[PDB]
Design a protein around this motif. Structure first.
Motif, mmCIF file in Angstrom:
data_model
loop_
_atom_site.group_PDB
_atom_site.id
_atom_site.type_symbol
_atom_site.label_atom_id
_atom_site.label_comp_id
_atom_site.label_asym_id
_atom_site.label_seq_id
_atom_site.Cartn_x
_atom_site.Cartn_y
_atom_site.Cartn_z
ATOM 1 N N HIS A 18 0.879 -1.171 0.000
ATOM 2 C CA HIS A 18 0.000 0.000 0.000
ATOM 3 C C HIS A 18 0.914 1.218 0.000
ATOM 4 O O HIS A 18 1.244 1.750 1.062
ATOM 5 C CB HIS A 18 -0.937 0.005 1.195
ATOM 6 C CG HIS A 18 -1.873 -1.158 1.232
ATOM 7 N ND1 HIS A 18 -2.952 -1.273 0.385
ATOM 8 C CD2 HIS A 18 -1.891 -2.262 2.014
ATOM 9 C CE1 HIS A 18 -3.593 -2.398 0.641
ATOM 10 N NE2 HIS A 18 -2.970 -3.015 1.627
ATOM 11 N N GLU A 52 0.146 4.908 1.858
ATOM 12 C CA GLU A 52 -0.051 5.075 3.287
ATOM 13 C C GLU A 52 1.042 4.360 4.065
ATOM 14 O O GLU A 52 1.756 3.507 3.533
ATOM 15 C CB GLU A 52 -1.389 4.511 3.731
ATOM 16 C CG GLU A 52 -1.294 3.026 3.862
ATOM 17 C CD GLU A 52 -2.606 2.336 3.769
ATOM 18 O OE1 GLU A 52 -2.699 1.263 4.386
ATOM 19 O OE2 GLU A 52 -3.524 2.853 3.102
ATOM 20 N N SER A 71 -11.034 -0.531 -3.810
ATOM 21 C CA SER A 71 -11.451 -1.876 -3.442
ATOM 22 C C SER A 71 -12.962 -2.025 -3.570
ATOM 23 O O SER A 71 -13.715 -1.057 -3.445
ATOM 24 C CB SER A 71 -11.016 -2.205 -2.015
ATOM 25 O OG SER A 71 -9.607 -2.240 -1.904
ATOM 26 N N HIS A 74 -15.280 -4.666 5.039
ATOM 27 C CA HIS A 74 -13.939 -4.303 5.483
ATOM 28 C C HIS A 74 -13.407 -3.095 4.721
ATOM 29 O O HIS A 74 -12.762 -2.217 5.307
ATOM 30 C CB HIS A 74 -13.000 -5.498 5.329
ATOM 31 C CG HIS A 74 -11.586 -5.212 5.730
ATOM 32 N ND1 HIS A 74 -11.247 -4.748 6.984
ATOM 33 C CD2 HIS A 74 -10.424 -5.327 5.045
ATOM 34 C CE1 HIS A 74 -9.939 -4.585 7.051
ATOM 35 N NE2 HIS A 74 -9.415 -4.930 5.888
ATOM 36 N N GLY A 100 -12.004 -7.790 8.463
ATOM 37 C CA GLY A 100 -10.593 -7.540 8.637
ATOM 38 C C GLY A 100 -10.236 -7.309 10.092
ATOM 39 O O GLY A 100 -10.906 -7.783 11.008
ATOM 40 N N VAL A 101 -9.149 -6.563 10.290
ATOM 41 C CA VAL A 101 -8.609 -6.268 11.611
ATOM 42 C C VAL A 101 -8.516 -4.767 11.852
ATOM 43 O O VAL A 101 -8.950 -4.265 12.893
ATOM 44 C CB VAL A 101 -7.231 -6.941 11.818
ATOM 45 C CG1 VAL A 101 -6.417 -6.195 12.859
ATOM 46 C CG2 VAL A 101 -7.402 -8.396 12.210
ATOM 47 N N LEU A 102 -7.974 -4.030 10.886
ATOM 48 C CA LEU A 102 -7.662 -2.620 11.070
ATOM 49 C C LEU A 102 -8.823 -1.697 10.729
ATOM 50 O O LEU A 102 -8.651 -0.475 10.768
ATOM 51 C CB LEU A 102 -6.438 -2.240 10.229
ATOM 52 C CG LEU A 102 -5.139 -2.975 10.568
ATOM 53 C CD1 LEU A 102 -4.040 -2.606 9.589
ATOM 54 C CD2 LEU A 102 -4.708 -2.686 11.994
ATOM 55 N N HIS A 162 -9.275 -10.678 -0.291
ATOM 56 C CA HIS A 162 -8.884 -10.577 1.109
ATOM 57 C C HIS A 162 -9.824 -11.438 1.946
ATOM 58 O O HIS A 162 -11.038 -11.217 1.943
ATOM 59 C CB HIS A 162 -8.926 -9.117 1.563
ATOM 60 C CG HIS A 162 -9.073 -8.931 3.043
ATOM 61 N ND1 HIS A 162 -8.042 -8.485 3.840
ATOM 62 C CD2 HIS A 162 -10.140 -9.088 3.864
ATOM 63 C CE1 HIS A 162 -8.459 -8.402 5.092
ATOM 64 N NE2 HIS A 162 -9.727 -8.763 5.132
ATOM 65 N N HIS A 196 -9.975 -13.592 5.848
ATOM 66 C CA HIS A 196 -9.509 -14.156 7.109
ATOM 67 C C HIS A 196 -10.296 -15.389 7.525
ATOM 68 O O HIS A 196 -9.700 -16.395 7.917
ATOM 69 C CB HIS A 196 -9.595 -13.111 8.226
ATOM 70 C CG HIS A 196 -8.489 -12.102 8.207
ATOM 71 N ND1 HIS A 196 -7.161 -12.451 8.302
ATOM 72 C CD2 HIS A 196 -8.517 -10.751 8.120
ATOM 73 C CE1 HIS A 196 -6.416 -11.360 8.268
ATOM 74 N NE2 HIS A 196 -7.216 -10.315 8.158
ATOM 75 N N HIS A 234 -4.799 -13.371 3.137
ATOM 76 C CA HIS A 234 -4.197 -13.693 4.429
ATOM 77 C C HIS A 234 -4.457 -15.122 4.883
ATOM 78 O O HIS A 234 -3.536 -15.772 5.384
ATOM 79 C CB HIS A 234 -4.680 -12.704 5.499
ATOM 80 C CG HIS A 234 -4.582 -11.271 5.077
ATOM 81 N ND1 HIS A 234 -3.383 -10.598 5.002
ATOM 82 C CD2 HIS A 234 -5.536 -10.383 4.709
ATOM 83 C CE1 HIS A 234 -3.600 -9.359 4.601
ATOM 84 N NE2 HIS A 234 -4.897 -9.203 4.421
ATOM 85 N N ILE A 261 -1.048 -16.210 11.853
ATOM 86 C CA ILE A 261 -0.606 -16.286 10.419
ATOM 87 C C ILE A 261 0.583 -17.232 10.205
ATOM 88 O O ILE A 261 0.565 -17.945 9.189
ATOM 89 C CB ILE A 261 -0.310 -14.872 9.873
ATOM 90 C CG1 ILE A 261 -1.585 -14.031 9.768
ATOM 91 C CG2 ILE A 261 0.426 -14.945 8.543
ATOM 92 C CD1 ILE A 261 -1.676 -12.932 10.800
ATOM 93 N N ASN A 315 2.349 -6.929 2.704
ATOM 94 C CA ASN A 315 1.336 -5.991 3.181
ATOM 95 C C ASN A 315 1.995 -4.760 3.799
ATOM 96 O O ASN A 315 1.710 -4.372 4.932
ATOM 97 C CB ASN A 315 0.376 -6.661 4.169
ATOM 98 C CG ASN A 315 -0.909 -5.878 4.370
ATOM 99 O OD1 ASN A 315 -0.960 -4.670 4.154
ATOM 100 N ND2 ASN A 315 -1.957 -6.569 4.790
HETATM 101 C C1 LIG Z 1 -5.680 1.523 1.492
HETATM 102 C C2 LIG Z 1 -5.451 0.181 2.186
HETATM 103 C C3 LIG Z 1 -6.736 -0.594 2.188
HETATM 104 C C4 LIG Z 1 -6.522 -1.776 2.865
HETATM 105 C C5 LIG Z 1 -7.320 -2.871 2.581
HETATM 106 CL CL1 LIG Z 1 -8.544 -2.701 1.402
HETATM 107 C C6 LIG Z 1 -7.130 -4.079 3.246
HETATM 108 C C7 LIG Z 1 -6.121 -4.185 4.195
HETATM 109 C C8 LIG Z 1 -5.913 -5.376 4.866
HETATM 110 O O1 LIG Z 1 -6.157 -6.455 4.329
HETATM 111 N N1 LIG Z 1 -5.412 -5.237 6.099
HETATM 112 C C9 LIG Z 1 -5.172 -6.380 6.989
HETATM 113 C C10 LIG Z 1 -3.925 -6.186 7.859
HETATM 114 C C11 LIG Z 1 -3.574 -7.393 8.447
HETATM 115 C C12 LIG Z 1 -3.607 -7.530 9.826
HETATM 116 C C13 LIG Z 1 -3.260 -8.741 10.410
HETATM 117 C C14 LIG Z 1 -2.876 -9.815 9.619
HETATM 118 C C15 LIG Z 1 -2.842 -9.677 8.240
HETATM 119 C C16 LIG Z 1 -3.191 -8.466 7.658
HETATM 120 C C17 LIG Z 1 -6.389 -6.502 7.883
HETATM 121 O O2 LIG Z 1 -6.720 -5.504 8.540
HETATM 122 O O3 LIG Z 1 -6.962 -7.590 7.878
HETATM 123 C C18 LIG Z 1 -5.335 -3.079 4.466
HETATM 124 O O4 LIG Z 1 -4.353 -3.179 5.395
HETATM 125 C C19 LIG Z 1 -5.516 -1.873 3.814
HETATM 126 C C20 LIG Z 1 -4.702 -0.795 4.118
HETATM 127 O O5 LIG Z 1 -3.739 -0.941 4.870
HETATM 128 O O6 LIG Z 1 -5.055 0.390 3.546
#
Ligand SMILES: C[C@@H]1Cc2c(Cl)cc(C(=O)N[C@@H](Cc3ccccc3)C(=O)O)c(O)c2C(=O)O1
Ligand SMILES: C[C@@H]1Cc2c(Cl)cc(C(=O)N[C@@H](Cc3ccccc3)C(=O)O)c(O)c2C(=O)O1
Ligand SMILES: C[C@@H]1Cc2c(Cl)cc(C(=O)N[C@@H](Cc3ccccc3)C(=O)O)c(O)c2C(=O)O1
Ligand SMILES: C[C@@H]1Cc2c(Cl)cc(C(=O)N[C@@H](Cc3ccccc3)C(=O)O)c(O)c2C(=O)O1
Ligand SMILES: [Zn+2]
Ligand SMILES: [Zn+2]
Ligand SMILES: [Zn+2]
Ligand SMILES: [Zn+2]
Ligand SMILES: [Zn+2]
Ligand SMILES: [Zn+2]
Ligand SMILES: [Zn+2]
Lengths: 399, 399, 399, 142
Positions: free
Chosen positions: C57, C60, C128, C135, C188-190, C223, C225, C243, C297, C316
């Motif tokens: 990404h 950011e 996306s 998410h 997702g997570v974040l 994407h 989980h 993931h 993971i 990532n």
């Molecule tokens: C612009 C961009 C959009 C975005 C999108 Cl669409 C998806 C993710 C993402 O898959 N993040 C993961 C980060 C992560 C966290 C833990 C384990 C694996 C991955 C999540 O939150 O599940 C993600 O991290 C991001 C991101 O960082 O900003």
């Protein structure tokens, strides 16, 4: 703590070339100027303070596809191009610039100050303030459907038509993060508008803009080609006039009595005269105005200098190619302005225009902005096109 | 280089018929008027300069289905009809017209000047400036849902209610590509409004319109039926009054002292009186106003001429059928105005009203706009309805 | 024509280290691989093809002020930061990247391809595609007034809820200038959302997305989980899973039978586990999901490798700090994946995932993307953190 | 009123999102937001019901036939020139709706797949056919 060794020092305050000197740089400022810690050798170079360009547009460059580009490209593309434009400007010896329009420069200035990208110190005016159908009106020459969907521009878009709207526009510029104010007092050349010198502001509106800006600690730069608009802007109390093509004895007297600064912009006039002969470069609404006005700026600037009007350095880049800003010096010298005065107009006079006292001269307590030239610019002005050393705020960018 | 041979020349400047003459036309202008190169023979024709109609609406024509047509037809249809209307106007001997309302005339003028279509030289006012519920208000007599959808008209639509709105409206007219300004100072006849002579502008608003237009080099024409609105418009400093139905001694004195021009428009009055007797031609709100005001114009115009008020030629076509504009001459002569003065009012007085000095008289350096009549118009005014030769800007359109 | 001299060649296609070799580079492509014209010496360096990061990404980077930043900063700031991020990524040995979200990368890719700024070759997914409250929903966790103002996101904003909306969303991605498609199959997570593994797409919607993308020549990355959403996405026919935290024997069997690629992203999981212990770094909605999910993971990726699931290289980044993308290699080697396979997963497997055959291996006719390492990475994987030579498309960026 | 030939006018063209006849192709973000996403009333359709509404709106606007862009073009501000931009189920809907109003359909097609789809759906004419091949010729002949 870097000690810079210079064979010849140029005194901006007086206008004379001194002998060998040693500058002590610490904390981004000049501490000592002892005549004569890491050592930098510039024995065969003339040492001069950094230059200032008081009229640039770092968010654009003129091209044969310029006018068709205003509906296809996004500001992100303009920022990606402004990165290279700013690097080119910094490498040419200009450590500071005053940006006079465009909503990417306040963001470029923030990026440069944070160290993300390289470039000069920017003083950004931001969006321009105009009236309905004015030179800086964003929706000039749009078809009916687009003009309805966008709506009539208001004070938040820069377009004002009353005193209260002007006050709100200055307040919105302050809110958007501007450092000064820029208004278009008359018509222009490169806009899709019929007039080039008609008065487009009333005295009671320019007075409101100046009064509102004085509260927020802002200075006002006015774009004026015609006589009446320029007279109105000078009488209202603006800080500088931008082109002054149709200046006459009366307006010169008013500017001399008021202390207004003059920015001739030779380069833009030469560029537009050269490019007006080509076919397809300009629209048919623009070509006549470009051919008529771009050819009378050199005579007016020479007359203004001979009448005692204070002149500062500005090129109106964005019209010309970024990075070739010093060619203006030679133009000034060809117009009859002395080389020493042309060099002073970019160092101390530019700082007086900007309203800052920390730059302009190589003296203790000031910012360490130093450039070095291969040859002497007082005998051969062409030496301004050969810069070998560039240091900004105590950091060496070109050795 | 075409030499035109004329048996009798009419001198617009003096008002007398001279003898045989030879005109030399080159570059679209008149070079020599030598008394006596391709040769054009008009030995049996009275030679006279081209005519000007200072009040037309080329974008429309009155019909029994006029009012129901404002919600079904698009401006493209109006342009397609204006093509034929403009050709008819040009063939009748009118080489120039002043258009006093519409948003197709600025496009028709651009098309004619580029040579795409044939027609006279147009000076277009563009959209009209009125107040809320005024004669030129675009949303007069609309139901509640439509007025909700469109919204209240603002300065960009021509409707103003304050000084700043009036200034913005003049600036928007300049931005839209207008050549002059037209305001409705009182009520009208053909609008879906209750009043016909009420004062609809304040002096402080007409003054703002005039002051704003003076900066952009515009002249202002005012539509006025009633006494109070006409007095306000004359005092504010407009250039011409359009109908002046209820003019009185005081207003005549003010117009004489100010130099305001008067455009009687006999044809519109005659047309509305004739058509007001029919049933279904006019709406029930319009018929009373049409019957009451259309019958008084001829008496006011005669009194104005006998009191020394400057009178110019205008017909208000769009009410009448485009192409029959010369019948107004006979009406003027029937009202008591001399035939020579009626002929001068369309050539030199019209040019004085328009603010142009390149047309009106057949003299060296002026535009080559020449028409020829079969018979003498000073003895028989009906000869104005028989035009045999029409030349505009050095180009022959009718032989 | 530059001849590069390498002491040891790494054969990506086979996975073995060869002996000394000489590469001939002309026209931005590799012409000859003759064993053994300007000369480049890398005698003490192991030569290897350029790396590819299939999950970044670039618009950011995660910070303690990340969430409060989504309402204050404009995309211009993100572009100004992405300039440095892209330079850091290119200098670390990654000559190509696949960007999986953000509307600045299509502009950054255009700028890099034009030579304005330096960086790797970008394959940008763009915006996306998610469902309501998903998410990747742009308006997740907004107060009522803001959600009223913006309106419900539609297919043009990426949010779809039916087959026709999914088709329109893919077409809008094509119109906006994307190179592939990215969907969020589960939570997702974040994100400011309650769920982390709930199924958020129906099979009939993912099938529509895949079918629409196949017409425009696009590949789809999903994407996921949770188990159910991942199973749906695999069955619909996506190209890669991002993931796969809760993958189980059945899903592994389906992926093996279908040929879907797996991108483990060790770095993001390690980063979120380390940062979840701190207070104030994450919101109270994000911290439980981050602590629960980011710790699983590494065990899933090892099991996937031991079960025969095809694994490609992705980190990532944007979560982790840009420019430290190769530490992922050591993580993979620590998880049990062999060093040779970890090196192949960034060169040939990444090219297979991207659908391009011009890069990945140092063979005649391919692009000249070459990097060089100080030490041998097969014996000591830490040697991946010491890059001394970087050449992209025949141009040397790091010597 | 004016002189000219007898005109049979198709009117506005019917395309999909980002298609060859899409009115907002290659516009910057601010303009694209102010205009809004084009809908069936503007000619841009993405489903069967939208296609039906678009044909009905063409009839309402006073058209004599229907024109669709089956593939990409050349003179548009778009990346593709021959990609398939209509589904068979959308062209079929356009043809079926037009048959009720007594309209004939002309299809713009450069690429093979879009041209094949348009021919199979039952359009009346093909406009450029640059990448026609033996199969498509056989289908057109039949
Ligand atoms: C612009 C961009 C959009 C975005 C999108 Cl669409 C998806 C993710 C993402 O898959 N993040 C993961 C980060 C992560 C966290 C833990 C384990 C694996 C991955 C999540 O939150 O599940 C993600 O991290 C991001 C991101 O960082 O900003
Ligand atoms: C964003 C920025 C906005 C802008 C504004 Cl607000 C004003 C000018 C301007 O003053 N241009 C001058 C260029 C010029 C032409 C001839 C002689 C002197 C100057 C003009 O057209 O009169 C101008 O050039 C520009 C410009 O280049 O873009
Ligand atoms: C587009 C154009 C707009 C327009 C305007 Cl703004 C004003 C007039 C106008 O002054 N009409 C006059 C017609 C008239 C009727 C009787 C005597 C004299 C004149 C009126 O109704 O008082 C007028 O007639 C028109 C018109 O015909 O359409
Ligand atoms: C208003 C009208 C709309 C329009 C439409 Cl909808 C389609 C076309 C068109 O099919 N143009 C073709 C021109 C062309 C170019 C090469 C070979 C054959 C034809 C194209 O760009 O593929 C086309 O040319 C035009 C056009 O010229 O403007
Ligand atoms: Zn200017
Ligand atoms: Zn400027
Ligand atoms: Zn009137
Ligand atoms: Zn009128
Ligand atoms: Zn993800
Ligand atoms: Zn991601
Ligand atoms: Zn076509």
């Amino acid at each position: 703590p870097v000690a810079v060794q210079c064979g010849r020092l140029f005194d901006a305050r007086s206008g004379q070339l001194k002998g060998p000197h040693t500058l002590l740089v610490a904390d981004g400022r000049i501490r000592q100027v002892l005549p004569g810690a890491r050592v930098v050798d510039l024995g065969d170079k003339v040492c001069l303070p950094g230059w200032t360009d008081l009229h640039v547009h770092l968010g654009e460059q003129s091209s044969p596809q310029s006018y068709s580009e205003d509906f296809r490209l996004d500001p992100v593309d303009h920022a990606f191009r402004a990165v290279g434009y700013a690097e080119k400007t910094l490498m040419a010896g200009f450590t500071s610039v005053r940006d006079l329009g465009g909503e990417v420069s306040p963001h470029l200035r923030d990026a440069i100050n944070q160290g993300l990208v390289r470039g000069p110190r920017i003083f950004a005016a931001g969006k321009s303030i105009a009236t309905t159908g004015g030179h800086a009106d964003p929706t000039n020459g749009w078809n009916e459907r687009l003009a309805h969907l966008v709506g009539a521009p208001g004070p938040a878009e820069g377009v004002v038509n009353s005193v209260d709207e002007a006050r709100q526009a200055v307040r919105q510029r302050y809110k958007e993060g501007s450092d000064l104010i820029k208004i278009t007092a008359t018509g222009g050349v490169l806009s899709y508008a019929r007039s080039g010198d008609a008065p487009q502001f009333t005295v009671d509106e320019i007075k409101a803009v100046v009064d509102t800006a004085r509260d927020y600690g802002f200075r006002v730069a006015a774009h004026a080609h015609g006589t009446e608009g320029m007279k109105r802007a000078v009488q209202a109390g603006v800080t500088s006039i931008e082109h002054g093509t149709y200046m006459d004895d009366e307006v010169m007297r008013l500017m001399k009595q008021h202390g207004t600064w003059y920015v001739p912009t030779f380069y833009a006039g030469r560029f537009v005269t050269e490019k007006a002969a080509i076919d397809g470069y300009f629209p048919e609404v623009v070509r006549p105005k470009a051919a008529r006005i771009g050819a009378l700026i050199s005579q007016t600037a020479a007359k203004a200098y001979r009448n005692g009007v204070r002149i500062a350095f500005g090129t109106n880049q964005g019209v010309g190619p970024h990075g070739d800003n010093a060619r203006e010096f030679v133009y000034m010298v060809e117009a009859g302005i002395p080389a020493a005065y042309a060099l002073q107009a970019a160092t101390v006079h530019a700082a007086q225009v900007l309203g800052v006292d920390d730059q302009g001269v190589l003296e203790p307590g000031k910012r360490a902005d130093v450039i070095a030239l291969a040859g002497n610019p007082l005998e051969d002005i062409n030496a301004v096109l050969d810069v070998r050393f560039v240091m900004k705020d105590g950091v060496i960018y070109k050795q």
